[PDB]
Nucleic acid binder design. Structure first.
Lengths: 124, 98, 155, 63
RNA sequence: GUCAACCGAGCGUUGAUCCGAGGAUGUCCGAAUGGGGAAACCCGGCACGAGUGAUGUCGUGUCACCAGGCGCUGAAUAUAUAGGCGUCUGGGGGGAACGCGGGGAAGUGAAACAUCUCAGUACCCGUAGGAAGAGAAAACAAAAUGUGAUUCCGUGAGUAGUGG
RNA sequence: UCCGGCUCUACCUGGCUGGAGGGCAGUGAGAAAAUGUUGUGGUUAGCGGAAAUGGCUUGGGAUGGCCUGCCGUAGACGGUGAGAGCCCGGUACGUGAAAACCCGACGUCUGUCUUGAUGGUGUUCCCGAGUAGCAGCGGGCCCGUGGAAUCUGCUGUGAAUCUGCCGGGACCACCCGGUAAGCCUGAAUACUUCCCAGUGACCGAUAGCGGAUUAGUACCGUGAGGGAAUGGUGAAAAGUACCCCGGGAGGGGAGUGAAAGAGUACCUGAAACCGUGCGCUUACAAUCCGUCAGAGCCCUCGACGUGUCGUGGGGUGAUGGCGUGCCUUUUGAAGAAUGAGCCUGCGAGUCAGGGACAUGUCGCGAGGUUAACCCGGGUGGGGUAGCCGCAGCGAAAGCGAGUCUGAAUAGGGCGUAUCCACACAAGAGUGUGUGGUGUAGUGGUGUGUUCUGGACCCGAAGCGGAGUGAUCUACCCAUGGCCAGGGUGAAG
RNA sequence: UCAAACUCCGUGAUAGCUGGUUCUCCCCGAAAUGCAUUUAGGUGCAGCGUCGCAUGUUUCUUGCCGGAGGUAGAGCUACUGG
RNA sequence: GGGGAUAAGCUCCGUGCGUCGAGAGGGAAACAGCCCAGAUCGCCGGCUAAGGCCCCUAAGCGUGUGCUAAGUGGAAAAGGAU
RNA sequence: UUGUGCGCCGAUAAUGUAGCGGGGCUCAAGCACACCGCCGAAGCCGCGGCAGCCAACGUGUUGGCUGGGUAGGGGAGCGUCCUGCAUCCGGUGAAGCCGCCGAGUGAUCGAGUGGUGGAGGGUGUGGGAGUGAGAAUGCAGGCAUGAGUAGCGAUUAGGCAAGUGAGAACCUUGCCCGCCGAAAGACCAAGGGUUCCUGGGCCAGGCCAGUCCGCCCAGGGUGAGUCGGGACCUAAGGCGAGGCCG
RNA sequence: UCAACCAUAGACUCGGCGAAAUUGCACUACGAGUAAAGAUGCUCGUUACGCGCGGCAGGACGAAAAGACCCCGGGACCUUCA
RNA sequence: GUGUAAGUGCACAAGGGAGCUUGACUGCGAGACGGACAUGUCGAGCAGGGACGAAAGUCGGGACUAGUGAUCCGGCACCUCU
């Protein structure tokens, strides 16, 4: 009837300590210290999975804006223009264009220039 | 235990009176079950009742006229009720108590 | 409360530095008392006569419908056990691994004969039960046994 | 062993046919010199137990 | 014999080693019992026997206490007794639980607490037995024409009741 | 039944004291000792006991796999170089006791009634004395002094013998039962220091008896008293002969061995922990020590081509952004509130019980179910004493689908499974009388809570009983010893 | 070690007290209020939660009609007081 | 609204008012209760709220008309002053 | 002289600017009013997977709503041990352990394969639990940080040559030197129990090392008419025949 | 006042033996501020080459002791015309 | 002014006064309030037997709200209960 407990614990110990090969100190040897850091770690991964979207989008925007401003148009009015023109390309791909092919991006810039309102600060 | 306030089982009055240890509880039978387990009618004693399983074995029996009575029965019990007296009188039977 | 010793507070309550302890045989020690342990107890439970007999009749029906209830007058020639006889006869009558045998008390020779076989598990019909039936595949009644069983139950 | 019963709950609580619980009522014994009779009259009889104490009283009566 | 080998020297078909029942021997302490004593060690008496030129020494036994029976005596003191002397038989202490008689708590519960409870438990005492104790109606019962020693189990019953 | 003598005495009777056939009984509780036969009656050692060197292969070893046979009143168990019915030990079964011990059996031996009984008939005598009873304090009986019987303990007082006395819950009268104060009495029942044989949905070296190992030992304490730790080579020691370094330990070769990643520190041999090598990275940097993006270098798989991207994967990871340990307890803790040095192992809602309530499931169904116990190698059969339901109201008598209160059908309370259909009355809230539909409880088990018990676990200070302690220290007793040397100069 | 030693036993004493209580997921999901309390840090019942059965929108929201209030405000030769 | 000094991050009541408790994420320089919004998991997709667009920090040294001269903005009273 | 919108002085604390979050800003990057766009969250939408309640239909498909969560209530499951029953693998190498490659929504899994190793295990259904530890100033064993740090036990003080020895500050001897000398000297009692001598020995011990030692092993060794006690006596006190009390 | 010098035992260096209490972690700065109202760990800025040794003792609310003062609950012992 | 504090009411008087007088009763009680629970408050209407009044009708204490204390244990009178 008496049930030694060895196996039933060893299992999860093995799991965790496999999943902490790279940590630095008592976070890489000891179950009671790596468990905690696994909590914090998985949590920070979750949060970063939700937020790398905004990170990349920020990046894409900075690239777009600098490209445009070297072609003498602002970001805000560029996107006003593409919205007006019904153009569909997203920012990841506008940035890819900016990097690789600035010519096509300048063409899109010119489209927006054409399709913007005349008197941008009008009361309409 | 109720905090400290005098509980329900210590602030209500006690029930009134006593028991009369020498009480004679009778065990009843009603005429409904007679009619429901004696189609042929006839003599019905304590053992005839014990057979059909309407009372206990060490019973001291009483008879009562709840249900209908059209069968004829020569009932034997200890004590009756006037309703059974009259119902047996109407169905033409022998209410010969002990 | 049954272990040896422990009936003295091993050291102070305060001043020591170490924890608080009241006996040297408490559970958290090494040599200490089991807490909620096994105890000598009974395991029987009171199943009723009607449920039991319903079980047995249903079981015999389960075997009968599938034609596994065989009868027999005897397993042997006069008053000299010989397991080779009974084994050959069960080979004639059966090929399955396991089997039940119902032989009365007086007919001791059949019991003594068939006892030693690997599969067989002999029984008297006065202690006829359900586990011993269901574990089997075939069931060999004696005729005396059937008659006793039937005229004992049926009245 | 068995579950022993509560004396007070047996002496100040009974059960009817359909399982109701019954009690008597209070302020009836003494100091009647000034209690009007209507007040003395709604306190007679028996009364069905409340809801809130039914359970407690079951647990006291039975075991 | 063994942990536990090593060495030496032996026995055994003429029946060993081994197993079982009965006997014998059975140092000293221990109820311990000749006296004494810090338990396992100090000193003796009496009868016999061994031994020395004699003493010393040695061996075998036996010597406590009470209760009872028997036997001799009957102090102050007259009867006569307690007592004293001899002999015979018992008891003496140990034990794991179980039993019967007696004594006999407290923490606890009561959300305090004294009555109550814990428990007549633990423990202590005196005595036993293989089991004990109880046990033959100065009993129950309720007019039933009933039962017929006692004890232990099931139920009645967590009831009738008792109770700050 | 015959006689011997006896009733003081010779004689008639009645009544004793003896022996004899006999009967009854016996080591009985009813009196007690030994006797000798005596039972394959029992215990105290044991013994025989069926059947394969079977074949091929594996392997160090076959007891394995596969294929061939056999025994079986014996395939229970264990061991043997790896799971063995056919190897061994032993089992089923049958055997066996010179001696001692226990059961009865006997014949001795011992008594014991026999000299006897059934019934008649009218009155005197006896029927257990400091007791029973009564009073006063008390114990225990369901019963806490209460109206409190019966049973009893100490004191004080204190009766009768059958028209007597004690009890039937104060007490009195009637009836009933029984005959105290003298004594023994088996069987059913409880228990295991020890012994014998077995079983296990019990443990398997931090467990299990505290004790698999010298275990109540070592060690601690003055003392009572506490009270530990340590199992495993391998099939068998074949335990490394010999050589080399070294003072030796210890090791390297040579060997044994199936394996020395089995060397008397030895089955396997984890983690913490301690180090050696190989790749990346790190000395201008402010880091709950990580995560998301990711340069660069190193390893690898694959399609190709003289080296080369890829629906890749893995280790490191410059640099950037984000980011305030874990638990408990707190309104609120990253918290400078508590706890944790780390690893490994151990450590807390459990069991009983026809217990209670609620709920699932199963059998039965107006019935349901047994307890103790008896028989059973087993888990099975029986056992009706009991309990729950089937009618309640009422303090109770008592009555009864109604009942209680009350003067009352006059209202109400409780109850009449529930619904259904038609009526009559009112819409003061619906009721009342009919008809049919017809009532569901109980016993196992599982879960949850719960009651009594140590009742989820650990933790006091401190209460009580019985004993150990004055060798330390407090005081006293008995008996001995110690206080260098120099000054002052009382009485007389 | 002494405002009443020590040891064994009762005894696993008891604490309205502190701490601790181990694997996973799915669904719903609070309170910190009231009366009482030898009671205020605890507990009993009601409150709010869920599970099961029953009753089916009875809850809630908006509009319209009906109803009492004596609050803000204002008022005082409309009372009591300044 | 009471007590308090009409002080307290004070204390005590109300409230189909809220949030925290038990609730993350964004903004508030960091900040349980404030504003927005109530997280089934993934995506190197898009639009918005509160808030904000010179660089740090992604987004406007945005348009138009006027004020500010004090680094006011980016603490403050009675009162004083062409 | 009124009312306004921004403004000035009043203005004033102690580690360091320090009452914009910083740089910096009036060539507003500051206040107000209107206008234009934009960024921005785990919100909403978009593409996908799971799940709960209800509903519709057909022999489990779809759809709408829903899915933060502590105390807590309810539901469904993995894993460990022993077992009843049926079958499978196993000295042609099970378990256990280290792994690699992979899987599952999770507890977890590999009948998927390598190394080590040497004898029992798995599967499905039921049964029963000493049934899952990270914390109790928790218990037992082992090992770390502090740390190769503090100390190495008095106020007497050691030295040179030679010696054996593998190895010498310390062990043996020689000559010096210094210490106590009403004691740190010689003799008894209590108490301890072989510590004494000889021979051999140095993996443990000695606070270093050690050829040395009260350490280890073996052997040896204590001799009483007169010594200190008994056989001789008694005090304090004890035990206490009989005995008295209880 | 007003402190200076000297010698020994230590302390420092070398050779040997070799512990300890304590400890969630770690490549452990300062400031103004925010916060459970006294921050090595947060924000915004400033400073700083890695690793050691002797030494001081401001902080780490430093180590030790489940506060000894206070309050609550339970006990204990002591007193008294309870 | 209302017996006694305050409020709500009272001139339609519940204020003041005079005559009879005992309902300062018995047996009940629909439906309701308030409600943790026990307590607490009103209550039309029915019956006997009455008061007052010519009758209708009112009277089960006081203009209303305070004026008292649960349960247990005992005591007194009556009962056709044991």
């Amino acid at each position: 009837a008496r049930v030694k407990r060895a196996l039933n614990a060893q299992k999860k110990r093995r799991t965790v300590l496999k999943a902490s090969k790279g940590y630095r100190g008592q976070r890489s040897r000891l179950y009671r210290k790596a468990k905690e850091q696994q909590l914090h770690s998985l949590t920070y991964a979750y949060r970063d999975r939700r937020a790398r979207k905004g990170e990349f989008r920020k990046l894409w925007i900075s690239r777009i804006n600098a490209a445009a401003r070297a072609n003498d148009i602002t970001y805000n009015r560029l996107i006003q223009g593409l919205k007006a023109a019904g153009v569909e390309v997203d920012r990841k791909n506008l940035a890819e264009l900016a990097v690789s092919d600035p010519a096509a991006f300048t063409a899109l810039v010119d489209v927006a220039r054409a399709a913007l309102p005349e008197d941008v600060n009008a009361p309409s | 235990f109720e905090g400290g306030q005098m509980p329900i089982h210590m602030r209500l009055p006690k029930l009134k009176g006593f028991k009369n240890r020498f009480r004679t509880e009778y065990q009843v039978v009603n005429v409904g079950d007679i009619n429901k387990a004696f189609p042929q009618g006839g003599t019905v004693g304590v053992d005839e009742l014990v057979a059909k399983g309407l009372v206990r074995k060490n019973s001291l029996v009483k008879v009562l006229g709840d249900g209908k009575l059209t069968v004829k029965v020569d009932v034997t019990a200890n004590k009756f009720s006037g309703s059974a007296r009259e119902a047996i009188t109407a169905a033409g039977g022998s209410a010969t108590e002990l | 409360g049954e272990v040896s010793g422990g009936g003295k507070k091993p050291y102070r309550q305060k001043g020591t530095g170490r924890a608080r302890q009241g006996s040297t045989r408490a559970p958290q020690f090494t040599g200490g008392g089991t807490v909620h342990g096994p105890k000598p107890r009974d395991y029987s439970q009171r199943t009723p006569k009607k449920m039991i007999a319903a079980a047995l009749r249903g079981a015999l029906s389960d075997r009968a419908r599938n034609d596994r209830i065989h009868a027999v007058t005897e397993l042997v020639e006069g008053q000299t056990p010989s397991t080779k006889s009974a084994k050959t006869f069960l080979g004639t009558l059966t090929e399955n691994k396991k089997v039940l045998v119902v032989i009365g008390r007086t007919d001791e020779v059949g019991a003594k004969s068939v006892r030693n076989l690997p599969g067989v598990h002999v029984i008297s019909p006065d202690q006829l039960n359900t586990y011993d039936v269901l574990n089997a595949d075939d069931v060999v009644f004696s005729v005396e046994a059937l008659n006793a069983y039937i005229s004992a139950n049926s009245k | 062993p068995k579950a022993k019963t509560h004396s007070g709950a047996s002496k100040r609580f009974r059960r009817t046919g359909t399982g109701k619980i019954v009690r008597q009522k209070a302020n009836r014994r003494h100091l009647l010199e000034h209690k009007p009779t209507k007040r003395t009259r709604r306190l007679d009889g028996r009364t069905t137990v409340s809801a809130a104490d039914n359970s407690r009283i079951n647990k006291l009566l039975n075991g």
